[PDB]
Design a protein around this ligand. Structure first.
Ligand SMILES: O=P(O)(O)OC[C@H](O)CO
Length: 295
């Protein structure tokens, strides 16, 4: 099953690229480049992460730079090419980022009680004439991008397995590029149906990007892990430990981070493993024929 790009080794079998032991292959950058996942306009999250990044700079002794990447593909490539050192990758991109960018995931947000996750929802606007999933037949369904779990792969698998509905035969797919573009397009009646992450939906609703009376939910999936956070495999081990320490030592209380992510139920960073927590995502990837051909 799951295979890393041959440019990486997995000598310990945890499915993630091993930290190099050849010192000429390790990087110790004076500026650490961080990127959150482009589920919305990154300008939304610049100040959300600002204090966290200051803590990261203090813990690691490095300068830190927020990279406002606009698409998953550019984010994956930036880490593969060595320009991006720490990232949160959207749920659906974690297997690809692990396989083709040497991403070493180690944490994920969770509620204060340790519970975690988000669901994909299919949404419409009130009065659209699309009043359940079956009503999508013969119409359009807005997807975000093909590396998205909730915005493409999970809804495609569900519509095919449970509603006898395949893109290009039973509905026409359109791509918005981001969850927030999908959700905005629904509320503004550009889209009669979109598959979106309900975590993002809730945070946009709390920030008044859209209003509750503009969105109706028609479907809610099983629960998935949320954004996985990790490090490019080839930073020095000492630096990677300090980055991990920074994540777990950050005090959320009163911060812009807590102000934002409390709106989708998060309060803390917990450890995860790629092998365990992303098994369900690798299965959905496989159900969509995703091959991880880094090219
Ligand atoms: O459904 P995805 O793959 O777009 O992931 C969105 C967020 O990362 C979920 O936390």
């Amino acid at each position: 099953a799951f295979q890393l790009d041959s440019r990486y080794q997995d000598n310990d079998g945890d499915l993630i690229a091993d930290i190099p032991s050849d010192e000429s292959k390790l990087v110790d950058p004076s500026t650490l480049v961080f990127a959150y996942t482009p589920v919305e306009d990154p300008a939304v999250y610049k100040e959300v992460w600002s204090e966290f990044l200051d803590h990261l700079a203090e813990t690691t002794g490095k300068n830190v730079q927020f990279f406002p990447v606009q698409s998953n593909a550019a984010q994956i490539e930036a880490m593969r090419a060595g320009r991006l050192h720490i990232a949160g990758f959207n749920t659906g991109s974690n297997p690809l980022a692990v396989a083709c960018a040497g991403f070493r995931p180690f944490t994920m947000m969770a509620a204060a009680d340790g519970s975690f996750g988000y669901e994909m929802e299919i949404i419409s606007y009130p009065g659209s004439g699309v009043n359940d999933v079956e009503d999508i037949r013969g119409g359009e369904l807005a997807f975000t991008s093909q590396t998205s779990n909730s915005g493409f792969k999970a809804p495609s698998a569900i519509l095919k397995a449970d509603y006898n509905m395949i893109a290009g035969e039973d509905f026409e797919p359109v791509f918005s590029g981001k969850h927030d573009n999908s959700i905005l397009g629904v509320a503004n009646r550009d889209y009669k149906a979109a598959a979106v992450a309900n975590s993002v939906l809730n945070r946009m609703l709390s920030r008044d990007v859209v209003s509750e009376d503009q969105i109706v939910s028609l479907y809610k999936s099983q629960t998935f892990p949320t954004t996985g956070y990790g490090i490019a495999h080839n930073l020095t081990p000492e630096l990677q430990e300090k980055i991990q320490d920074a994540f777990f030592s950050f005090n959320w209380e009163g911060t812009a981070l807590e102000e934002e992510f409390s709106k989708s139920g998060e309060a803390q960073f917990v450890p995860i493993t790629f092998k365990n927590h992303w098994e369900v995502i690798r299965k959905i990837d496989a159900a969509n024929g995703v091959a991880y051909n880094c090219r």
